[PDB]
PDB file of C-alpha atoms in Angstrom:
ATOM      1  CA  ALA A   1      63.442  90.427  97.451  1.00 43.76           C
ATOM      2  CA  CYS A   2      67.035  91.725  96.039  1.00 45.17           C
ATOM      3  CA  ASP A   3      69.039  95.226  96.408  1.00 45.09           C
ATOM      4  CA  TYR A   4      70.359  94.356  92.763  1.00 45.20           C
ATOM      5  CA  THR A   5      69.300  91.748  90.358  1.00 44.81           C
ATOM      6  CA  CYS A   6      71.205  90.628  87.553  1.00 44.51           C
ATOM      7  CA  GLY A   7      69.617  88.483  85.223  1.00 44.26           C
ATOM      8  CA  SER A   8      68.809  85.553  87.266  1.00 44.93           C
ATOM      9  CA  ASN A   9      71.052  86.511  90.316  1.00 45.57           C
ATOM     10  CA  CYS A  10      70.072  88.433  93.940  1.00 45.04           C
ATOM     11  CA  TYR A  11      72.610  90.418  95.290  1.00 47.98           C
ATOM     12  CA  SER A  12      71.985  92.375  98.494  1.00 47.26           C
ATOM     13  CA  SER A  13      74.279  95.583  99.281  1.00 44.58           C
ATOM     14  CA  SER A  14      76.631  92.772 101.382  1.00 43.45           C
ATOM     15  CA  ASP A  15      77.437  91.253  98.751  1.00 40.71           C
ATOM     16  CA  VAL A  16      78.488  94.207  96.360  1.00 38.47           C
ATOM     17  CA  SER A  17      80.440  95.529  99.218  1.00 36.37           C
ATOM     18  CA  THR A  18      82.392  92.557  99.732  1.00 38.00           C
ATOM     19  CA  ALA A  19      83.055  92.358  96.147  1.00 38.20           C
ATOM     20  CA  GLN A  20      84.017  95.980  95.706  1.00 39.10           C
ATOM     21  CA  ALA A  21      86.396  96.141  98.770  1.00 40.15           C
ATOM     22  CA  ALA A  22      88.116  92.955  97.148  1.00 39.72           C
ATOM     23  CA  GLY A  23      87.934  94.402  93.690  1.00 39.95           C
ATOM     24  CA  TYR A  24      89.210  97.669  95.283  1.00 42.11           C
ATOM     25  CA  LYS A  25      91.998  96.520  97.408  1.00 39.34           C
ATOM     26  CA  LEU A  26      93.952  94.896  94.317  1.00 38.12           C
ATOM     27  CA  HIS A  27      93.508  97.628  92.336  1.00 42.05           C
ATOM     28  CA  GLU A  28      95.396  99.821  95.114  1.00 44.14           C
ATOM     29  CA  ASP A  29      97.853  96.854  95.076  1.00 46.69           C
ATOM     30  CA  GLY A  30      98.870  96.852  91.846  1.00 46.07           C
ATOM     31  CA  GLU A  31      97.786  93.247  91.551  1.00 47.18           C
ATOM     32  CA  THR A  32      95.329  91.419  89.559  1.00 46.22           C
ATOM     33  CA  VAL A  33      93.885  87.618  89.112  1.00 42.90           C
ATOM     34  CA  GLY A  34      93.176  85.423  86.549  1.00 42.25           C
ATOM     35  CA  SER A  35      94.138  85.196  82.902  1.00 41.12           C
ATOM     36  CA  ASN A  36      91.842  88.390  81.899  1.00 40.50           C
ATOM     37  CA  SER A  37      93.727  90.247  85.077  1.00 41.76           C
ATOM     38  CA  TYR A  38      90.645  92.094  86.931  1.00 43.62           C
ATOM     39  CA  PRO A  39      90.186  94.310  88.239  1.00 40.07           C
ATOM     40  CA  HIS A  40      90.557  96.334  85.062  1.00 40.22           C
ATOM     41  CA  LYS A  41      89.007  99.550  83.360  1.00 38.54           C
ATOM     42  CA  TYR A  42      85.785  99.745  82.417  1.00 39.91           C
ATOM     43  CA  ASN A  43      84.804 101.766  79.106  1.00 40.93           C
ATOM     44  CA  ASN A  44      81.236 102.818  79.061  1.00 45.14           C
ATOM     45  CA  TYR A  45      80.450 101.969  75.597  1.00 43.41           C
ATOM     46  CA  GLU A  46      76.977 101.287  76.814  1.00 43.27           C
ATOM     47  CA  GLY A  47      76.447 104.824  78.243  1.00 42.12           C
ATOM     48  CA  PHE A  48      75.331 104.342  81.500  1.00 40.19           C
ATOM     49  CA  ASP A  49      74.307 107.372  83.732  1.00 33.97           C
ATOM     50  CA  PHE A  50      76.706 106.428  86.250  1.00 30.79           C
ATOM     51  CA  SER A  51      76.692 109.552  88.408  1.00 29.28           C
ATOM     52  CA  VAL A  52      80.296 109.221  89.929  1.00 28.15           C
ATOM     53  CA  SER A  53      83.408 110.065  88.494  1.00 22.46           C
ATOM     54  CA  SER A  54      85.529 108.223  85.996  1.00 21.71           C
ATOM     55  CA  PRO A  55      87.484 106.357  85.784  1.00 21.56           C
ATOM     56  CA  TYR A  56      85.817 103.018  86.181  1.00 20.67           C
ATOM     57  CA  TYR A  57      87.101  99.786  86.826  1.00 17.79           C
ATOM     58  CA  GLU A  58      85.014  96.310  86.590  1.00 20.65           C
ATOM     59  CA  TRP A  59      85.506  93.206  89.063  1.00 19.58           C
ATOM     60  CA  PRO A  60      83.327  89.894  88.675  1.00 17.79           C
ATOM     61  CA  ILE A  61      80.520  89.250  91.261  1.00 16.08           C
ATOM     62  CA  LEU A  62      79.717  86.245  92.160  1.00 16.13           C
ATOM     63  CA  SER A  63      76.575  83.908  92.558  1.00 13.49           C
ATOM     64  CA  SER A  64      78.163  81.575  94.478  1.00 12.78           C
ATOM     65  CA  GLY A  65      78.798  84.010  97.103  1.00 10.87           C
ATOM     66  CA  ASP A  66      82.545  83.462  96.588  1.00 13.02           C
ATOM     67  CA  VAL A  67      85.104  86.724  96.166  1.00 11.82           C
ATOM     68  CA  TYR A  68      87.144  86.287  92.750  1.00 13.10           C
ATOM     69  CA  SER A  69      90.109  84.452  92.702  1.00 12.43           C
ATOM     70  CA  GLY A  70      90.731  83.388  89.040  1.00  7.77           C
ATOM     71  CA  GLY A  71      88.773  81.225  86.861  1.00  7.56           C
ATOM     72  CA  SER A  72      85.397  81.824  85.687  1.00  8.44           C
ATOM     73  CA  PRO A  73      84.349  85.175  85.734  1.00  4.22           C
ATOM     74  CA  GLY A  74      80.764  84.935  85.503  1.00  6.84           C
ATOM     75  CA  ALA A  75      78.802  87.418  83.745  1.00  5.29           C
ATOM     76  CA  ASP A  76      78.029  90.040  86.413  1.00  2.51           C
ATOM     77  CA  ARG A  77      80.137  92.743  87.334  1.00  3.42           C
ATOM     78  CA  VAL A  78      80.831  95.743  90.066  1.00  4.58           C
ATOM     79  CA  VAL A  79      82.081  98.842  88.736  1.00  4.56           C
ATOM     80  CA  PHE A  80      83.618 101.370  90.971  1.00  7.86           C
ATOM     81  CA  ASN A  81      86.119 104.706  90.668  1.00  9.24           C
ATOM     82  CA  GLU A  82      89.116 105.028  92.150  1.00  9.36           C
ATOM     83  CA  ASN A  83      87.898 106.940  94.991  1.00  9.18           C
ATOM     84  CA  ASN A  84      86.559 103.389  95.629  1.00 12.65           C
ATOM     85  CA  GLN A  85      82.677 104.902  94.872  1.00 12.76           C
ATOM     86  CA  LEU A  86      80.053 102.373  93.276  1.00 15.32           C
ATOM     87  CA  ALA A  87      79.204 103.312  89.675  1.00 14.91           C
ATOM     88  CA  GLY A  88      76.756 100.309  89.153  1.00 13.73           C
ATOM     89  CA  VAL A  89      75.977  96.955  89.132  1.00 13.28           C
ATOM     90  CA  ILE A  90      75.808  95.472  85.681  1.00 14.15           C
ATOM     91  CA  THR A  91      75.715  92.127  84.064  1.00 12.85           C
ATOM     92  CA  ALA A  92      76.602  90.528  80.322  1.00 14.47           C
ATOM     93  CA  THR A  93      73.260  89.000  81.133  1.00 12.01           C
ATOM     94  CA  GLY A  94      70.350  89.930  78.906  1.00 12.17           C
ATOM     95  CA  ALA A  95      72.240  92.495  76.421  1.00 11.10           C
ATOM     96  CA  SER A  96      73.223  92.407  72.638  1.00 11.02           C
ATOM     97  CA  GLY A  97      76.971  91.238  72.405  1.00 13.51           C
ATOM     98  CA  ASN A  98      79.406  92.683  74.497  1.00 13.09           C
ATOM     99  CA  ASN A  99      76.790  95.252  75.483  1.00 10.78           C
ATOM    100  CA  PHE A 100      76.109  94.900  79.504  1.00  8.62           C
ATOM    101  CA  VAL A 101      73.005  96.272  80.838  1.00  9.25           C
ATOM    102  CA  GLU A 102      72.731  97.275  84.152  1.00 14.57           C
ATOM    103  CA  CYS A 103      71.472  95.249  86.925  1.00 13.15           C
ATOM    104  CA  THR A 104      67.956  96.180  88.233  1.00 15.18           C
TER     105      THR A 104
END
């Protein structure tokens, strides 16, 4: 089936790693992409039980299988810290307001 499921989307650990590495390479390069400038800090107002240390960053993960390069961010994100440890996979898909819900 799917390593991670974000609402309707199905992502495999390869998907997640392709998105995390990209994600992380810009953050170490002091760069960003798009109107809302990703990757950027993730706050954790949801209170997720992420066992890797903060701070956290979020990067769009796309259902198309493309690596985010500006434009529509989509509702799913990858969350990584400074050691490039995966915190988890979240989506805006299914929550109340700005809440994110964790992908399954």
